[PDB]
Amino acid sequence: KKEVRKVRIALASPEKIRSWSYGEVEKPETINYRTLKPERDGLFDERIFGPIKDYECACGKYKRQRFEGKVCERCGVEVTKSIVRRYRMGHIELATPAAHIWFVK
Amino acid sequence: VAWELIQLDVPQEKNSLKDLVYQAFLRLGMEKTARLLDALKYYGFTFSTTSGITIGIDDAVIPEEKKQYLEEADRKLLQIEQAYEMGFLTDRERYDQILQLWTETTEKVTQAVFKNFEENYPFNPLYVMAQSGARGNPQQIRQLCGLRGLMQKPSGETFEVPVRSSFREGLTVLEYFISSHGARKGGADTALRTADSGYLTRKLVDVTHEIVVREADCGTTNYISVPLFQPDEVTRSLRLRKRADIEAGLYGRVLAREVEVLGVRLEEGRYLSMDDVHLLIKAAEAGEIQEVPVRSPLTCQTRYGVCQKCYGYDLSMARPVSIGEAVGIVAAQSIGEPGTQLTMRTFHTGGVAGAADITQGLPRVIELFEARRPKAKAIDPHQLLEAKGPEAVERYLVEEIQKVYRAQGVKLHDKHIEIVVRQMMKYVEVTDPGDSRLLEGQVLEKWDVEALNERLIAEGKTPVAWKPLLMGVTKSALSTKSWLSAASFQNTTHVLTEAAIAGKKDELIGLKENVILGRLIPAGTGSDFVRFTQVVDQKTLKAIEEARKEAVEA
Amino acid sequence: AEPGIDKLFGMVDSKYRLTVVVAKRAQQLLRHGFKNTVLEPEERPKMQTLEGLFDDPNAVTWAMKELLTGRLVFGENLVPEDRLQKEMERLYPVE
Amino acid sequence: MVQVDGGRFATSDLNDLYRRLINRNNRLKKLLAQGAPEIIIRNEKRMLQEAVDALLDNGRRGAPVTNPGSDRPLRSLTDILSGKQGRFRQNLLGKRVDYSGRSVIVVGPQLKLHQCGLPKRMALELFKPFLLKKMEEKGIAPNVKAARRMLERQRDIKDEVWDALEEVIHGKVVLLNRAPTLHRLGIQAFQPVLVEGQSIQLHPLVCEAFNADFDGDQMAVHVPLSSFAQAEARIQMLSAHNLLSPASGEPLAKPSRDIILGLYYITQVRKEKKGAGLEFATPEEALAAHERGEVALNAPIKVAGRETSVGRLKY
Amino acid sequence: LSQFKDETNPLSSLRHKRRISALGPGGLTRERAGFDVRDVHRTHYGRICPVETPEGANIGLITSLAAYARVDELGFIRTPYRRVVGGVVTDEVVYMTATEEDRYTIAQANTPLEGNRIAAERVVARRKGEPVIVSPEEVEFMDVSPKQVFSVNTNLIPFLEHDDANRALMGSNMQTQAVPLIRAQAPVVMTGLEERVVRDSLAALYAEEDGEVAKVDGNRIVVRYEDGRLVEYPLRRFYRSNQGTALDQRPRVVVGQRVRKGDLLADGPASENGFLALGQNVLVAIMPFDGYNFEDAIVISEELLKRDFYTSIHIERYEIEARDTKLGPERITRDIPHLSEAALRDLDEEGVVRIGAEVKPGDILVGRTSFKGESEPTPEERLLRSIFGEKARDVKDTSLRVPPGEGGIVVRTVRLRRGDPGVELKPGVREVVRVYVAQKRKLQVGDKLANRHGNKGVVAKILPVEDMPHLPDGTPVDVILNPLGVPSRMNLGQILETHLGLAGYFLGQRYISPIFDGAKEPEIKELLAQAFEVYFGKRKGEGFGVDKREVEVLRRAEKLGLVTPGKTPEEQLKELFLQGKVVLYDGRTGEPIEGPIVVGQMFIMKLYHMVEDKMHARSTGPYSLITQQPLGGKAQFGGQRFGEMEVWALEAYGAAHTLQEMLTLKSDDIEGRNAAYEAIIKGEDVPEPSVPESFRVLVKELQALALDVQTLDEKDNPVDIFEGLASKR
Amino acid sequence: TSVYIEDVLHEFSTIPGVKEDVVEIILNLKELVVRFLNPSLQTVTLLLKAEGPKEVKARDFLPVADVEIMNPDLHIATLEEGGRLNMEVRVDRGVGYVPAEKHGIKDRINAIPVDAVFSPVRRVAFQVEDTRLGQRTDLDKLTLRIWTDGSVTPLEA
DNA sequence: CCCTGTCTGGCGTTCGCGCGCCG
RNA sequence: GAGUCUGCGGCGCGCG
DNA sequence: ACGCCAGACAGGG
């Protein structure tokens, strides 16, 4: 409930990467036409990122607020509005390191 | 009190009126002045309709002397030609001499046309609007009744042939097409000039935004002395500076020290009203004062911020500045507007000289806020700082800057340029370390902190020898303490790179950084001096005292 | 312009302080009930669809009209931050 | 990843880059596991590094392009954070107010600096919430949602609504803005006086502060929501309260072109003809003679006659 | 390079078509490179307008061509130049290349000529972009005419010779923005190309061959040519211009009429009689009123509205589509699920709106029915439905309504169903429904008008004929223009148009003053002398002489220097009339206006009312997806920008909270705005701002990049911006 | 005050066999000056119908007992052939100017209102010429000329 | 190895609003 | 006890 | 295209 009085930029530790992270996008699959739903692990999967929809999950096993903090037994979807979907971050575990061009150039 | 402040001995011009409102402002009070404003507004409008002044083609009256002056100068042109056809005048002298002939002949038809109205038609529909602060420009009226004479070629070399016509009679076929080039070159002018007015403002604001009034009379009594006389117009002859400019310098300022002049004792810290600045001028006239000690942001103590006695009077209101006011910004905005006001009105309405005026200033005011060897080395600040020192650069920049704006009609109080230029020297380089390595550019006042406790509280006098650094407004904004501010203009790319590396803790002070957050402004109602203030009713005053009285147990 | 703005400006040490005072006053004016005023009787604030401004038109319009009088008191630290809101709800009725 | 029109789908170019990186990284993992001939491993690690640049900053090293359609640099992260119409600028300048308005401006001669003419039709939208509640305090509407529906259509407004709005705006003030806001007077607060029509009546004296003139230009308008904003706006921001300019201690409420022309004309003195003697200063015969000479056609009522032209002698 | 045809008036479009550009393929020239290109070069003579260059960022790069300008074989705008062999000028012409032009010594058209013979030894000529005083013997070629120098759009300016090039530009531009008035009136004073405009443009319908008229419908005029043939000429009744202006061809020929080859049978969208017409000729008094006509601001007489003098038509094409959602096809039906029949009347035909129906803002133009949720019903809305009547058409009301602003009467309707004829229905799109609505716009305060010279201005007040300035004879003035707007600005051509116009009013005649060669001060004074007799001559015979008023104004007038002292009031008024000014009474007091005031027939046009005219005021509405800032579009206005310059403004002031509000409660504070609203609804005191989404989106955007930005406490310790969605799981 | 063309629905339509458009017609109607004789006539609907090759003038209106038409030869329309024009134009007694938008008259649902033009006076003019009375020359003489569309007379006005 | 000079490499360049088009 | 989803980037022109 | 700032490297003692 405190007042924000100081901001600070600091480099990121690989572990902090994962720290902020949720899931790893490992495939270039945006959305499959048939169903405008996230393809697989893809850049849009709801696990790695969040509930594409309001309070409802992917398949629809659990759909309201009563069980707001639990994950679906067959498919993984914890749900707040699609807002949790826009705030959560995912991570990609690179094979062999590369570097921030921000610090190199 | 109404006749005391009014001059009923002349026709009311915009200036006589301008003067009346101002007077009324100080004398009777803000809202009372507002009443007078509408009053003149109303009657001015009414009388305007009834006066029946209207333009008629015939109204634009051409002087009979026009034909003469033209012919007089015409035959003289032939002299200069014959003088050329023989081999006397060089290809150049020929040109330079022709131009001067018209430059004068035009100026001649100018005063002529007015002389006609003055003597013959006192109430010419066209003439009254120009004299009154209404509408019209001396160079403009000339193009209608007199004649607009010289329109330069695409490049810049003015044409050898003038435009013998006025707008009264048909400006001919080719004289139109030639004038047309001068219009094309202008329209472009305002575009670049409008962009550098915003440039000037962003720069001024980016360096000067943290500067805010939060204080107690800053006890550091060090100041700037405003000169009333100027050195070389004519080789060496001392002269009283122009009324307007001197007023600009000391109006509503605060004496840094007490001055006894013509008979009266101007006390220290007293805010000099325009009447007081009138006194000092009358004294210098007598020969009693050559400069004036006055509080200026140029010598304030408050590291971040300027106090009430250092700034002065002018809030939008006429009384001393109220703590928690966004001065710097006001200054920045005030320098931006004048830039954005003068280059858009000159491409839009009229000629030769004015085109040079605007284009030369905009480059100069861009080279003056940013530090670089001027085009023709005019004189370079960095070098000047090193050779003659700081206190001279500060006073040089201010005056050299007012030079262009005075020359363009704008009247901005020195206050503003000061607030800015001070920030261009809020930094210094180090030559004798203590805490961190020598070569470094850091916050001047932050050094005052180190050296202060280094010799006073903790022993071991490790003198932190610095060198005054004169950074330009731009560079100051670029490289400041907080990153938020820096992330705003220069390179977001760079700004953050550095600020990250070194975990930077942006302490929120200043309006730019704190706005980004959408947090309350550290200045204004957020101002630490009044962010906290409670109100009470004599009814709730007793009630709380009844709570303290119940504190006595058993 | 506005009623005695200069009179008001002279009553405070800084321009921006008067603004904070009026504002905070307008706030309490509404919160603890709109009858929390010090000069309602004879000549008071008024609107004209009827004379109904006596009840709840503009909050600060009152605050200014009161501060213009010498009844209220504004200081940096007049009465302890939390004890004020307590005594205020205890004495003023409208909700 | 949005549905646009007819089936068109719009996605932030970042996704294209993300794919780039994703594929390369995957393809790399597989190229290390399959078997690893030196050449092809670096060749790929190369592509990978590059890609890693793409998302963060495009253009520092070459410029990636969406396949043949638009040789446009896909807006890289760096790009999303830098510039005039950038993100850092987006925040700084706070771009879009919820209670704002903008229309054509027109002179309002009888209006006083204190007020401004604001179209009621505009005031309704602006002060909508403030009105909705006022509707319930009166009998015009049962509840908020009711009051909303009552006004969603123009033909449904009872004259009673106007009375309500006129009552809501009682002593509240609004802010006016001009095209380039150069100085603080670039915005001023006035008391809205509801008027009919589309245009906004501005006071003439302030037309100097804002560089505005009723020719094609238009001014915006905003409204102070908190009792606090209201306070400041009307105490320190009101037009009439900011009479002197921040630049010079000289007034800005100077009578303009129109007013000066009228106030001048009324105070000027006229001069006409001196053919016969102009010396009333001394003779008493000069008074009589040149008083009759004036009655005649010789001496005007305004004659160059030092002390007093016959114009003064007569009346 | 391809844009919307500017058809404010055919002239507009024609100009837009001939304006010369640099920018283009991208291969040729770019935008931040070109001070030498932008300038108007010498050879741009009769090849490129030097004025048509639009004011604004994009300038000089775009400029319509000149009058007789014509592209020869290869893009060299050749200009016409007539040959002159020795001291003899020919009626022969040579369109010359710009290169070839420098090889010769050419002279202007103003040269005195007796036919083929030059008339003055020292006469003007221009070698190569250089003014030169040549001899008749060296005059190898002469210019064709003053018009060629400029463009079409510019050649429509009366006394272009007396107006400042820069202010003339505005004039030419203004025309391109002239809106078609139901009542089209050609200018009281024209240039000479109004005819040519409408004809080379395809505004009016000309007769092919000579013949007689058979049928004159409001939809078609079937003429019968004398060759034994008869053709039916349909007239574009009411069509929608790209810019939304009306295009109607109004028949002007009666039944059975022998028509000349090339005569107007029907007038174009804005033609009076074969003449270009955008705006109308009105009597105007050039004096200052209270404050109504400000420096740029101008007045108007209610009488002008009485007779539809400044009225124009605007048609709009609203369109809606029946999309195919996987939730259920969006049906088009008269069924509007939730509240009244009163709103379903106009929607007579099942689904569509009936033609000739007056639709006001907020009415149903077309009804459509889509599905309520994304994929799931509603547990809360399920209990509401069941309580009053569970059996409720689950479908939601998504119907095309009249957006705020305005609507008029429904004139036409288009519907494309299932079995499409030869149309291209987009995918998913089941069926479309267009709804054309028209409305009559009457000249009002907001509007802006302007004369061909440059005086531009908006209407400040519609005064009743009752008290506006009126002439000795009951004829009152139409508009009052402020004098001050002409001194500083240099365009006396306008004051010259009003003087000849004055003559034309009482002499009942139109005139044509060429570009530089037109009418001259003496000739006008002459026509004015002829108008006095019509003015004052009828007055003498009708039975009365001079007023106390008329004489009083003469006194002050002689004391001014306008009338020779000692002459009769009859003779003095003449002298004063010749000056272009007449005496006028106030109309409000009946007292005269001390001092003569000029008045006359000035041609003024009405400028196109863009959607930038029709004002915008937003309370609450949409927001952007990625940024959470307010945005509108269709029906919700959209918020204003507050820019840093304005920020600074409040910053200067102690407007703290006012500044906060703007950055929080009003734009970005997601939770803030919400609570804000409710609070106000309640008449409560707005809660205290939460963090602005902009910062949040910033933070994360920055987090996207390596950088980690964290907020901190009193003591360097965390604080949380993201209320609680950052913690993991 | 209002008009009703039988087959016309909106004000922006055009009728076959009729040169003029509804807008030009309704405009010509504002020009019609009628004159009733007593208060009993507050709202009178004039009826007219003409067909074929005839020119429609104001005298074509079927005469009504207490109403008179002082604008006979006013041109209403030119019909070609198969020109069917059957309308009903309302007429009222009021004051000043009333936009068609302000009253919105609806005798028939498809009828279209028209701008009200109520002054029977087109222009007024007065002159104050000096007159001589034996003793003092300084005197005023007012003569005001009034023009009327016919509805009422200059004296009545 | 030093200081000076020269091409070199990175960024910026008004402000808000209309309309209409296009993948 | 109502709230989803669409409007993006760019281009052209026009206002002041 | 330009203008400006800041920079990193190469030439002449």
Ligand SMILES: Nc1ncnc2c1ncn2[C@@H]1O[C@H](COP(=O)(O)CP(=O)(O)OP(=O)(O)O)[C@@H](O)[C@H]1O
């Ligand atoms: N390229 C441009 N950029 C920004 N603003 C522009 C502009 N072109 C025009 N304007 C703005 O809109 C206004 C239009 O110019 P004017 O109305 O002529 C102002 P002005 O300086 O009063 O000239 P004036 O005295 O002839 O009226 C200017 O004040 C300027 O603020």
Ligand SMILES: [Mg+2]
């Ligand atoms: Mg202007």
Ligand SMILES: [Mg+2]
């Ligand atoms: Mg303007």
Ligand SMILES: [Zn+2]
């Ligand atoms: Zn599931």
Ligand SMILES: [Zn+2]
């Ligand atoms: Zn100080």
